[PDB]
Amino acid sequence: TTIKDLWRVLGRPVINGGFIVGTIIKPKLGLRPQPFANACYDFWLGGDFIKNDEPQGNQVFAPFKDTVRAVADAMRRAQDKTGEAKLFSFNITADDHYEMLARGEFILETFADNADHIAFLVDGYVAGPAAVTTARRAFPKQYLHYHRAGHGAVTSPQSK
Amino acid sequence: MDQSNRYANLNLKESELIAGGRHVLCAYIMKPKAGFGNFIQTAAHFAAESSTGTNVEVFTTDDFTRGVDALVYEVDEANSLMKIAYPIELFDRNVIDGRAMIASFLTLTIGNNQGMGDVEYAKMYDFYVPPAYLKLFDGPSTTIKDLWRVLGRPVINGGFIVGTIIKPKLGLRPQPFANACYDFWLGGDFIKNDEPQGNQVFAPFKDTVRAVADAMRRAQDKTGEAKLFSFNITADDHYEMLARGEFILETFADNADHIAFLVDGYVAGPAAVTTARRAFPKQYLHYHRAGHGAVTSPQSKRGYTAFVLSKMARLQGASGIHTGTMGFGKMEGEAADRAIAYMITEDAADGPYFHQEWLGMNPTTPIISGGMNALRMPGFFDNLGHSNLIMTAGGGAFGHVDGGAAGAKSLRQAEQCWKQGADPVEFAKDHREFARAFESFPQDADKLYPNWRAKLK
Amino acid sequence: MDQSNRYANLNLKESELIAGGRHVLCAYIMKPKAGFGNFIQTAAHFAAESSTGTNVEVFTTDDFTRGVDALVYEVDEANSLMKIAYPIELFDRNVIDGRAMIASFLTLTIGNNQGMGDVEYAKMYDFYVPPAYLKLFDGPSTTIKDLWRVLGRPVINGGFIVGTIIKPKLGLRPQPFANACYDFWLGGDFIKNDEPQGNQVFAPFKDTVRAVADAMRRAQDKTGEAKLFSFNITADDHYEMLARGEFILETFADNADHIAFLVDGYVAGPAAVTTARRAFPKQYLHYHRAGHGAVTSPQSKRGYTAFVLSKMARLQGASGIHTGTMGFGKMEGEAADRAIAYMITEDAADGPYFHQEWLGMNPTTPIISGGMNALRMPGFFDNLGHSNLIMTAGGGAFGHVDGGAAGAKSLRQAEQCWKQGADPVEFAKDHREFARAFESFPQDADKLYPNWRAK
Ligand SMILES: O=C(O)[C@@](O)(COP(=O)(O)O)[C@H](O)[C@H](O)COP(=O)(O)O
Ligand SMILES: O=C(O)[C@@](O)(COP(=O)(O)O)[C@H](O)[C@H](O)COP(=O)(O)O
Ligand SMILES: [Mg+2]
Ligand SMILES: [Mg+2]
Ligand SMILES: [Mg+2]
């Protein structure tokens, strides 16, 4: 999957479809499911794409399934209000391959007719290539968003 | 019962329906049966049976239902033409991933309407799929580019893939089967299973797969060139398809990207095509259409055309589909079938009634097969205009008098002649294997090249 | 190229080919195109393209190959008849369990031969399957007995299952859909999804399944009788079919044995039918044949007949298949179609060309549907001779002027009229739901019972 597939969902040209206006839900951690979804809705009134901040998932104060359901409702509301397609990139990173599958399968089923508006975020540097491949091979029709948190430990020019 | 007031709206404009992007359009050639309704009444009942209604009024109908009715928007009784607009909300979607299914498109648009007692016949000639519905289809994941890359060809306009089918259709035991493979691969690129070859008692699947893998490795060592094989993994059982594909990839090992999977998509159905597309997206999916002629033949006034079949196969995710020889081979076909190839390969193309934008959906290769040989190829290519495709010649290769390798070479040379714009008889004087195709198929040579004897001596 | 010396052996005796048990026999109505070969030459080429050959000689052919050639063994050019014997070794088998696949039978016997440039047309009217090949097919695992048992009927000759289809075909949202189910179930037994109903954006699958399960509980509590539902689980993706079926059974819970699974087997194909048969063998498999008319219609001279389709469906494992109304309803059909029902229900039966022994393979129910209503049923049963079947009437139930429940009772009562041997107009004098079906469908009433209003 490539940006072509995001441009197509947005109704843009599939060749040089242009700039995708995005954000990250901030606070990095701390928003409960409904204030999280309220921030999504607000941003989507003027923007295209939202990604989870890299550590957001299934914290005790923002359970994964409740957050996924509130975000799916916010996507429908924002799309109904604006008449424009909206995208979300969900963190499905886990140590356990079966947890990654369980997260991705739940998201696609929940988003239903908006399932092609979903990207899957993987923290590929800390979880490793095995986690990246789990998402690439299990969900090849969903845009795979590689987040590189931790890379700076070796990539910095300060490191030789 | 006259349902034309509900199901016909001839004041709708086709460009507004296309522009709106909320409807699938289908164009049919139809005739009412004698003693029932007129053309519009019959077309209206056809739309009702293809969307929300039945042959009588039901008291459970509400206005929400009426809003998703399929509508007859254009008729031309003189040319037996009927066009229907299907609201895209009617089509079924997967619960697991929200994607489209061709089974739902088929059920509504060419399902029960094919058994109506008040219709003599109705055949779909074209369909339009708007962006909102088009993007929900799988589309191809692997293309000819992936075969060209393995062959060391350019990934854009990589050219002609010289192929064959292992003949006899059935009857070769595993080692004679693999020997024919090896012989052809000394001069050619690609081999496909003949459509029914699989796990017959006399040619067990695992033994054949192992012998073919050894023949691929020996031909590649002998020639220094990459070779391809397309295996039939068709089964009624999904788990048998998986078991066949998994065994092949493991056995071929470092040559696993040289493998294509063949599915008899018309007889096994879209479910079998989707099993291969979704289980093995990194393996070229070769759609074989055995049985299609029962509806696609122009002799049939029912079902759908080969153009419609080919267009659906691209949505389903075939990497390639058999498009026929366009009148140049042994099966039914016409020169005008070149438009089928353009619909499945281009990003934008014209069907008989609708223009289609593919929005970057991957192309489906036209696979040319059916009574082809070296002698018939130049005329075929003149009609199509290119050779960025796979052509398989079973009888044309294994019926060459000097063997499979010579027959493969004869097909390579045929395309080299067409590419150089050469006269085939003159060209033949300097290309033996191609000149020996004249002697292997002397009935084709007398028809296509009269007096080839006097010049080829 | 004339291949008749190899692929035609008209000295073979059909009775010896049957007795040998080593061949599948197919009977076709075939016409050659002009300017090619004569009838036998064309039939021989047809057999070559349907077994071991092509249109030219290939030097890889050996005598072992010649031994598995399909052979033209009988021709009747005057009646355009061609009969071909296929050695059973030709047919593909599963690597995982050694069983047969209908996809291989179809590929060889009615595959590429349907695109031949030298044939005008060729349609299969009958086929014979010997014991050695027959026993390798799945066959049905669930039958009408399993529905009769759930209904509390005798498991032998349990009788007529009163059914409907939820109409509108599409458009009802989940609660309006479930309300129509509840209403019909107050008078009837069985409800099927209309063939395209599934997971439309306006009627999501899980919401509809949950509302229907609540309606089943309410109708069962109200009536004290068991109710059945046949859900469409058709999908291109095998994993979507499993996901739909698994959700339904879990949701219906203690009513899970009241569920049948509907598969659009002609458009989704044999692969979809086998997914349901093998994944859910304890759930009645309802084969819906939408699209079949493109080849089965007598207007077509290609492909195969409805008889051939129905016979294959029994081998595939359909618990039931739509066999049509045999000319009594809105779809194309002939009264002679009663022989289709007998082929799929009996242990031994005659097709147009071949007698078939089923060796105890389970029967497939004839599912009767398509423009049926209470008025048309007596004539239907008189032609068939029995009512041990499922009949679904969508328009016939939901077009009844007094509602779905009354619609259901008119169907029940019209079978009681036929079973009792009563005159339908006299019977209607004492059965109001039946009588009101005459008022609901007055054009059918005027044709079938001329002076019903006076009486
Ligand atoms: O079995 C055969 O006849 C072929 O292998 C061709 O063999 P030959 O080269 O010897 O003729 C193909 O299956 C047909 O081409 C199918 O027709 P189509 O491509 O139209 O679907
Ligand atoms: O959609 C329909 O038309 C039906 O639900 C019948 O509804 P009605 O009762 O309202 O007519 C069935 O699918 C047809 O009977 C199929 O034909 P067949 O059984 O011949 O395959
Ligand atoms: Mg971040
Ligand atoms: Mg073939
Ligand atoms: Mg129906």
Residue B100 is classified by DSSP as: B
**Residue at B37 is within a domain:** yes
Residue B265 sits in the same domain as residue B148: yes
The C residues from 49 to 68 touching B (CB cutoff 8 Å) are 49, 51-62, 64-68
Give B89's contacts in chain A (Cβ within 8 Å).
none
Residue C35 sits in the same domain as residue C58: yes
**Residue at C427 is within a domain:** yes
Q: Is B369 in the pocket of ligand 1 (CB under 6 A)?
A: yes
Ligand 1 centroid distance, CA of B393 (Å): 8
| Complete DSSP assignment for B285-340 | EEEE-TTTHHHHSTT--SEE-HHHHHHHHHHHT-SEEE---TTSSSBS--GGGHHH
Ligand 3 centroid distance, CA of C296 (Å): 61
Residue of B24, B52, B56, B207 for testing the chain C interface, max C β-carbons within 10 Å: B56
DSSP 3-state assignment of C124? strand
Q: How far apart are CA B151 and CA B220, in angstroms?
A: 11
**Residue at B221 is within a domain:** yes
Residue C268 is classified by DSSP as: S
Q: How far apart are CA B208 and CA A94, in angstroms?
A: 42
Residue where a domain terminates, one of B118, B137, B156: B137
Residues 6 or more apart whose Cβ sits within 8 Å of residue C438: C375, C428, C445, C449, C452
Look at chain C and report how many structural domains it folds into: 2
Residue B24 sits in the same domain as residue B144: no
**Cα Rg of chain B, angstroms:** 24
**Could you say which ligand is closest to the alpha carbon of residue A123?**
3
**Residue at C316 is within a domain:** yes
Nearest to C374 by CA among C278, C274, C275, C449: C449
Q: How far apart are CA B398 and CA B400, in angstroms?
A: 5
Opening angle at CA C408, ends C403 and C410, nearest 5: 95
Report CA C183 to chain centroid distance, whole Å: 28
Q: How far apart are CA C177 and CA C211, in angstroms?
A: 8
- First CA to last CA distance, chain B: 74
Tell me the helix, strand and coil percentages in chain C, rounded to 5.
45, 20, 40
Contact of C190 with C164, CB cutoff 8 Å:
yes
CATH at residue C89? 3.30.70.150
Residue where a domain terminates, one of C81, C115, C137: C137
DSSP 3-state assignment of B445? helix
B185: its two tokens = 């691969």
C240-258 in b/e form (b: 16+ CB < 10 A) is bbbbbbebbbebbeebebb
Q: How far apart are CA C452 and CA C455, in angstroms?
A: 5
Opening angle at CA C396, ends C393 and C398, nearest 5: 100
* Distances in whole angstroms, Cα of residue B401 to Cα of each of B48, B395, B437, B450, C304: 59, 11, 8, 21, 38
* Distances in whole angstroms, Cα of residue B385 to Cα of each of B189, B322, B356, C282: 22, 17, 21, 55
- First CA to last CA distance, chain A: 34
Residue B151 sits in the same domain as residue B230: yes
- Residue B181 main-chain phi, psi, to 5 deg: -55, -55
- Number of other CB atoms surrounding residue A110 within 10 Å: 17
Subunit partners of chain A (3 or more CB pairs within 8 A) = B
Ligand 4 centroid distance, CA of C288 (Å): 30
Interchain contact B363–A (C-beta under 8 A): no
**Residue at B406 is within a domain:** yes
- Are B292 and C371 inside 8 Å of each other by CB? no
Contact of B178 with B407, CB cutoff 8 Å:
no
Contact of C267 with C300, CB cutoff 8 Å:
no
Residue B183 sits in the same domain as residue B298: yes
Opening angle at CA C392, ends C387 and C396, nearest 5: 110
**Residue at C326 is within a domain:** yes
Phi-psi region of B92 (alpha: psi -120 to 50; beta: other; left: phi over 0): beta
| Complete DSSP assignment for B155-220 | SSS---EEEEE-SSSS---HHHHHHHHHHHHTT-SEEE--TT-S-BTTB-HHHHHHHHHHHHHHHH
Q: How far apart are CA B453 and CA B456, in angstroms?
A: 5
Pocket test residue of B165, B167, B286, B334 for ligand 1, highest count of atoms within 8 A of CB: B165
Residue C361 sits in the same domain as residue C393: yes
Residue C203 is classified by DSSP as: B
Pure H helices in B102-157: 102-110, 131-134, 144-151
DSSP 3-state assignment of C360? coil
Report CA A39 to chain centroid distance, whole Å: 15
Q: Which pairs from C439-447 meet CB under 8 Å and 24+ separation?
A: C439/C401, C440/C373, C440/C399, C440/C400, C440/C401, C440/C410, C441/B56, C441/C373, C441/C375, C441/C396, C441/C399, C444/C373, C444/C375, C444/C376, C445/C375
Q: How far apart are CA B268 and CA C72, in angstroms?
A: 26
Q: How far apart are CA C74 and CA C83, in angstroms?
A: 5
**Cα Rg of chain A, angstroms:** 16
A12-35 in b/e form (b: 16+ CB < 10 A) is bebeebeeeeebebeeeeebebee
- B337 labeled part of a ligand binding site: no
Contact of B60 with C167, CB cutoff 8 Å:
yes
A139: its two tokens = 């969900």
Q: Is C400 in the pocket of ligand 2 (CB under 6 A)?
A: no
Q: How many CA atoms lie within 13 A of C187 on its CB side?
A: 21
Q: Which residue of B has its CA nearest to C301?
A: B300
- Are C200 and B93 inside 8 Å of each other by CB? yes
Ligand 3 centroid distance, CA of A117 (Å): 20
Report CA A45 to chain centroid distance, whole Å: 18
Give B88's contacts in chain A (Cβ within 8 Å).
none
Task: Pick the catalytic residue from A81, A86, A147, A151.
Answer: A147
Q: By residue range, what is the domain housing residue C321?
A: 138-440
Residue B322 sits in the same domain as residue B343: yes
Find tokens 């954000």 and name the residue. Answer: A23
Residue C393 is classified by DSSP as: -
**Residue at B448 is within a domain:** no
Of C52, C172, C300, the CB nearest to B168: C52
- Number of other CB atoms surrounding residue C445 within 10 Å: 22
Residue B160 sits in the same domain as residue B26: no
Experimental method: X-ray
Q: Is C333 in the pocket of ligand 2 (CB under 6 A)?
A: no
Residue C396 sits in the same domain as residue C258: yes
Q: How far apart are CA A143 and CA C88, in angstroms?
A: 48
Residue B119 sits in the same domain as residue B147: no
Contact of C308 with C105, CB cutoff 8 Å:
no
Q: How far apart are CA C163 and CA C392, in angstroms?
A: 4
CATH at residue B359? 3.20.20.110
- Are A8 and B360 inside 8 Å of each other by CB? yes
Cis preceding linkage at A55, omega within 30: no
Nearest to C219 by CA among C248, C242, C187: C187
Residue where a domain terminates, one of C137, C169, C184: C137
Q: How far apart are CA C368 and CA A105, in angstroms?
A: 39
Nearest to B90 by CA among B23, B144, B186: B23
* Distances in whole angstroms, Cα of residue B239 to Cα of each of B234, B245, B276, C242: 11, 10, 11, 13
**Residue at C454 is within a domain:** no
Residue C272 sits in the same domain as residue C123: no
Residue B59 sits in the same domain as residue B18: yes
Contact of C125 with C308, CB cutoff 8 Å:
yes
- Number of other CB atoms surrounding residue B452 within 10 Å: 19
For the CA atoms of B195, B198, B202, B204, the dihedral, rounded to the nearest 10 degrees, stands at 160
- C369 labeled part of a ligand binding site: yes
Q: How many CA atoms lie within 13 A of C344 on its CB side?
A: 32
Which amino acid does the sequence have at A116?
Answer: D
Opening angle at CA B40, ends B35 and B46, nearest 5: 85
